[PDB]
Design an enzyme around this catalytic site. Structure first.
Site, PDB file in Angstrom:
ATOM      1  N   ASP A  14       0.843  -1.190   0.000  1.00 25.17           N
ATOM      2  CA  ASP A  14       0.000   0.000   0.000  1.00 25.17           C
ATOM      3  C   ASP A  14       0.877   1.238   0.000  1.00 25.17           C
ATOM      4  O   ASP A  14       1.727   1.395   0.870  1.00 25.17           O
ATOM      5  CB  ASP A  14      -0.926   0.011   1.223  1.00 25.17           C
ATOM      6  CG  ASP A  14      -1.801   1.252   1.276  1.00 25.17           C
ATOM      7  OD1 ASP A  14      -2.846   1.247   0.603  1.00 25.17           O
ATOM      8  OD2 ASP A  14      -1.440   2.218   1.985  1.00 25.17           O
ATOM      9  N   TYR A  72       3.510  10.090  -0.371  1.00 30.82           N
ATOM     10  CA  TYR A  72       4.420   9.522   0.629  1.00 30.82           C
ATOM     11  C   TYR A  72       5.880   9.760   0.229  1.00 30.82           C
ATOM     12  O   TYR A  72       6.800   9.492   1.009  1.00 30.82           O
ATOM     13  CB  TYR A  72       4.191   8.020   0.825  1.00 30.82           C
ATOM     14  CG  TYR A  72       2.838   7.616   1.376  1.00 30.82           C
ATOM     15  CD1 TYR A  72       1.914   8.564   1.809  1.00 30.82           C
ATOM     16  CD2 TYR A  72       2.478   6.277   1.441  1.00 30.82           C
ATOM     17  CE1 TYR A  72       0.673   8.177   2.296  1.00 30.82           C
ATOM     18  CE2 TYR A  72       1.251   5.884   1.926  1.00 30.82           C
ATOM     19  CZ  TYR A  72       0.350   6.829   2.354  1.00 30.82           C
ATOM     20  OH  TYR A  72      -0.869   6.414   2.832  1.00 30.82           O
ATOM     21  N   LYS A 127      -2.994   6.093  -4.375  1.00 29.57           N
ATOM     22  CA  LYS A 127      -4.050   6.985  -3.905  1.00 29.57           C
ATOM     23  C   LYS A 127      -4.005   8.361  -4.557  1.00 29.57           C
ATOM     24  O   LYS A 127      -2.937   8.935  -4.760  1.00 29.57           O
ATOM     25  CB  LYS A 127      -3.962   7.158  -2.385  1.00 29.57           C
ATOM     26  CG  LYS A 127      -3.850   5.849  -1.632  1.00 29.57           C
ATOM     27  CD  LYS A 127      -3.985   6.063  -0.134  1.00 29.57           C
ATOM     28  CE  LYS A 127      -3.652   4.783   0.629  1.00 29.57           C
ATOM     29  NZ  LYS A 127      -2.168   4.608   0.770  1.00 29.57           N
ATOM     30  N   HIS A 159      -8.031   9.358  -1.773  1.00 32.15           N
ATOM     31  CA  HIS A 159      -7.322   9.293  -0.487  1.00 32.15           C
ATOM     32  C   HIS A 159      -8.161   9.856   0.656  1.00 32.15           C
ATOM     33  O   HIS A 159      -8.205   9.292   1.752  1.00 32.15           O
ATOM     34  CB  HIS A 159      -5.999  10.046  -0.593  1.00 32.15           C
ATOM     35  CG  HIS A 159      -4.994   9.669   0.452  1.00 32.15           C
ATOM     36  ND1 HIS A 159      -3.637   9.679   0.211  1.00 32.15           N
ATOM     37  CD2 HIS A 159      -5.144   9.278   1.740  1.00 32.15           C
ATOM     38  CE1 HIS A 159      -2.996   9.308   1.306  1.00 32.15           C
ATOM     39  NE2 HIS A 159      -3.887   9.060   2.248  1.00 32.15           N
TER      40      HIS A 159
HETATM   41  N1  NAP Z   1      -5.621   6.042   3.694  1.00 30.38           N
HETATM   42  C1  NAP Z   1      -5.127   6.788   4.702  1.00 30.38           C
HETATM   43  O1  NAP Z   1      -5.571   7.903   4.933  1.00 30.38           O
HETATM   44  C2  NAP Z   1      -4.050   6.215   5.534  1.00 30.38           C
HETATM   45  C3  NAP Z   1      -3.762   6.737   6.796  1.00 30.38           C
HETATM   46  C4  NAP Z   1      -2.749   6.144   7.530  1.00 30.38           C
HETATM   47  C5  NAP Z   1      -2.069   5.062   6.994  1.00 30.38           C
HETATM   48  N2  NAP Z   1      -2.358   4.592   5.794  1.00 30.38           N
HETATM   49  C6  NAP Z   1      -1.643   3.407   5.298  1.00 30.38           C
HETATM   50  O2  NAP Z   1      -1.661   2.367   6.316  1.00 30.38           O
HETATM   51  C7  NAP Z   1      -0.287   1.994   6.593  1.00 30.38           C
HETATM   52  C8  NAP Z   1      -0.134   1.545   8.049  1.00 30.38           C
HETATM   53  O3  NAP Z   1      -0.718   2.512   8.929  1.00 30.38           O
HETATM   54  P1  NAP Z   1       0.399   3.267   9.820  1.00 30.38           P
HETATM   55  O4  NAP Z   1       1.767   3.307   9.116  1.00 30.38           O
HETATM   56  O5  NAP Z   1      -0.069   4.726  10.001  1.00 30.38           O
HETATM   57  O6  NAP Z   1       0.556   2.725  11.351  1.00 30.38           O
HETATM   58  P2  NAP Z   1       0.659   1.155  11.767  1.00 30.38           P
HETATM   59  O7  NAP Z   1       0.901   0.132  10.551  1.00 30.38           O
HETATM   60  O8  NAP Z   1      -0.595   0.777  12.443  1.00 30.38           O
HETATM   61  O9  NAP Z   1       1.875   1.079  12.820  1.00 30.38           O
HETATM   62  C9  NAP Z   1       3.094   1.540  12.237  1.00 30.38           C
HETATM   63  C10 NAP Z   1       4.077   1.709  13.398  1.00 30.38           C
HETATM   64  O10 NAP Z   1       4.165   0.464  14.105  1.00 30.38           O
HETATM   65  C11 NAP Z   1       5.537   0.012  14.119  1.00 30.38           C
HETATM   66  N3  NAP Z   1       5.476  -1.444  14.035  1.00 30.38           N
HETATM   67  C12 NAP Z   1       5.229  -2.204  12.926  1.00 30.38           C
HETATM   68  N4  NAP Z   1       5.170  -3.462  13.258  1.00 30.38           N
HETATM   69  C13 NAP Z   1       5.342  -3.577  14.606  1.00 30.38           C
HETATM   70  C14 NAP Z   1       5.373  -4.649  15.506  1.00 30.38           C
HETATM   71  N5  NAP Z   1       5.186  -5.946  15.065  1.00 30.38           N
HETATM   72  N6  NAP Z   1       5.573  -4.380  16.798  1.00 30.38           N
HETATM   73  C15 NAP Z   1       5.746  -3.142  17.228  1.00 30.38           C
HETATM   74  N7  NAP Z   1       5.726  -2.102  16.419  1.00 30.38           N
HETATM   75  C16 NAP Z   1       5.536  -2.282  15.114  1.00 30.38           C
HETATM   76  C17 NAP Z   1       6.242   0.701  12.924  1.00 30.38           C
HETATM   77  O11 NAP Z   1       7.603   0.976  13.236  1.00 30.38           O
HETATM   78  P3  NAP Z   1       8.688   0.182  12.344  1.00 30.38           P
HETATM   79  O12 NAP Z   1       8.586   0.551  10.908  1.00 30.38           O
HETATM   80  O13 NAP Z   1      10.103   0.676  12.926  1.00 30.38           O
HETATM   81  O14 NAP Z   1       8.496  -1.396  12.535  1.00 30.38           O
HETATM   82  C18 NAP Z   1       5.495   2.057  12.924  1.00 30.38           C
HETATM   83  O15 NAP Z   1       6.076   2.924  13.898  1.00 30.38           O
HETATM   84  C19 NAP Z   1       0.493   3.293   6.340  1.00 30.38           C
HETATM   85  O16 NAP Z   1       1.895   3.050   6.216  1.00 30.38           O
HETATM   86  C20 NAP Z   1      -0.158   3.688   5.001  1.00 30.38           C
HETATM   87  O17 NAP Z   1       0.278   2.804   3.971  1.00 30.38           O
HETATM   88  C21 NAP Z   1      -3.314   5.126   5.063  1.00 30.38           C
HETATM   89  C1  AOM Z   2       0.070  11.812   5.004  1.00 27.66           C
HETATM   90  C2  AOM Z   2      -0.569  11.450   6.360  1.00 27.66           C
HETATM   91  C3  AOM Z   2      -0.086  10.068   6.802  1.00 27.66           C
HETATM   92  C4  AOM Z   2      -0.443   8.978   5.764  1.00 27.66           C
HETATM   93  C5  AOM Z   2      -1.923   8.961   5.397  1.00 27.66           C
HETATM   94  O1  AOM Z   2      -2.101   8.159   4.208  1.00 27.66           O
HETATM   95  C6  AOM Z   2      -2.530  10.338   5.183  1.00 27.66           C
HETATM   96  C7  AOM Z   2      -2.115  11.345   6.256  1.00 27.66           C
HETATM   97  C8  AOM Z   2      -2.790  12.692   6.035  1.00 27.66           C
HETATM   98  C9  AOM Z   2      -2.385  13.713   7.094  1.00 27.66           C
HETATM   99  C10 AOM Z   2      -0.863  13.872   7.165  1.00 27.66           C
HETATM  100  C11 AOM Z   2      -0.199  12.501   7.442  1.00 27.66           C
HETATM  101  C12 AOM Z   2       1.331  12.622   7.647  1.00 27.66           C
HETATM  102  C13 AOM Z   2       1.754  13.780   8.605  1.00 27.66           C
HETATM  103  C14 AOM Z   2       1.093  15.091   8.212  1.00 27.66           C
HETATM  104  C15 AOM Z   2       1.593  15.581   6.847  1.00 27.66           C
HETATM  105  C16 AOM Z   2       1.228  16.221   9.243  1.00 27.66           C
HETATM  106  O2  AOM Z   2       2.456  16.962   9.196  1.00 27.66           O
HETATM  107  C17 AOM Z   2       0.053  17.153   8.968  1.00 27.66           C
HETATM  108  C18 AOM Z   2      -1.071  16.251   8.358  1.00 27.66           C
HETATM  109  C19 AOM Z   2      -0.431  14.846   8.257  1.00 27.66           C
HETATM  110 CL    CL Z   3      -1.715  12.239  -5.728  1.00 30.34          CL
END
Ligand code: NAP
Ligand code: AOM
Ligand code: CL
Length: 325
Positions: A52, A57, A86, A119
């Protein structure tokens, strides 16, 4: 029905999505160049077949580098890999949709993406800035027109540039806008939203299930808890007493329990790790299953409280999180 070798679930358009993927958002400033590419390669080696990502990013070129390398060496075929990209808020103007996707294809150096999603339902002012604000700090909102944006998305699928279309951070009302669209050609197959034991999305999941829309749980491990943008009021998810207790029972970590929980109920999970060990750890969720009482107990941790509130956008006409669901 889910194994490390075979864990894809059906999408409504005849395609399928691997129930676990690697998330790739990482803070640009504290992330070494190449960390993303390395992590995607390790994930593919580990068994992940879903990545993803997003142009905003800033590392989509690394994602492409990694995918292409694994294809070239014969580790996977292109058809074996599922990439989700996205469309950001500054690119919702219908005429910008295809050029925006084409930019991502050129950055990945791939011919199509497997899933392309809006997104956020909010539109921002188009331009060279991802987060447009005036000198006063006022978020410059563009008059969102979601159906017209969706039509341009549909044209991208018609052209063969993307297999499946979806959305992210859409609420029930916003999903209805699309689903009830005059002359709808391609219904959204996926809604990517925050989802985990503290926010199990009961009502949204029920609604999506009724419309054959699969939920992808972003931040499935409760986020990196960066206060600069994350709501750090709630205690860290992976420290939960029940999750850790269940972890001891199965000799699994809280993270593994949390991921198993969502996939066991048909929710796709996209945990992000750029750590060799944790990338592998997050994938080891097919050699056990939670009891129905355990699922209930975990689902009862539901806070109905979000780690990702994006309160700075709470007044945008399309802010998703004011409605119940
Ligand atoms: N559509 C949207 O608006 C949106 C919003 C947020 C995220 N996303 C997508 O969803 C993905 C995942 O969400 P997220 O990155 O925000 O947070 P997350 O996957 O829920 O957690 C990420 C954090 O957990 C740590 N981590 C990973 N595996 C672990 C484990 N087994 N034990 C302990 N810690 C662990 C990672 O550090 P390390 O890398 O050092 O392991 C990182 O600090 C994003 O990368 C992005 O692709 C989309
Ligand atoms: C890009 C992210 C994370 C991944 C996810 O896919 C969407 C969000 C939207 C809000 C961003 C955030 C990253 C951190 C930002 C840039 C802050 O500095 C202010 C608003 C936040
Ligand atoms: Cl874009």
């Amino acid at each position: 029905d889910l194994s490390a070798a075979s864990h894809r679930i059906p999408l409504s358009d005849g395609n399928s999505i691997p129930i676990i993927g690697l998330g790739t958002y990482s803070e640009p400033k504290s992330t070494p160049k190449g960390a993303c590419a390395t992590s995607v390669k390790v994930a593919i080696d580990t068994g992940y077949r879903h990545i993803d990502g997003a142009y905003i990013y800033q590392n989509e070129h690394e994602v492409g580098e990694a995918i292409r390398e694994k294809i070239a060496e014969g580790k996977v075929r292109r058809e074996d890999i599922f990439y989700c990209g996205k469309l950001w808020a500054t690119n919702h103007v219908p005429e910008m949709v295809r050029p925006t996707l084409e930019r991502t294809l050129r950055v990945l150096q791939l011919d199509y993406v497997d899933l392309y999603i809006i997104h956020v339902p909010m539109a921002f002012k188009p331009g060279d800035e991802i987060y447009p604000r005036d000198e006063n700090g006022k978020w410059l909102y563009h008059k969102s027109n979601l159906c017209a944006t969706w039509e341009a998305m549909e044209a991208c699928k018609d052209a063969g540039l993307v297999k499946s279309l979806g959305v992210s951070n859409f609420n029930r009302r916003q999903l209805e806008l699309i689903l009830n669209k005059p002359g709808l050609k391609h219904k959204p197959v996926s809604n990517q939203v925050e989802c985990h034991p503290y926010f199990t999305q009961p009502k949204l999941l029920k609604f999506c299930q009724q419309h054959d829309i699969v939920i992808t749980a972003y931040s499935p491990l409760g986020t990196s808890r960066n206060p600069i943008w994350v709501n750090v009021s709630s205690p860290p998810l992976l420290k939960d007493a029940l999750l850790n207790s269940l972890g001891k029972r199965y000799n699994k970590t809280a993270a593994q329990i949390v991921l198993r929980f969502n996939i066991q109920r048909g929710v796709v999970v996209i945990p992000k790790s750029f750590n060799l060990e944790r990338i592998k750890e997050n994938f080891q969720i097919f050699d056990f299953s939670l009891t129905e009482e355990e699922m209930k107990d975990i689902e009862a941790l539901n806070k109905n409280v979000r780690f990702v509130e994006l309160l700075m956008w709470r007044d945008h006409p399309e802010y998703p999180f004011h409605d119940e669901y």
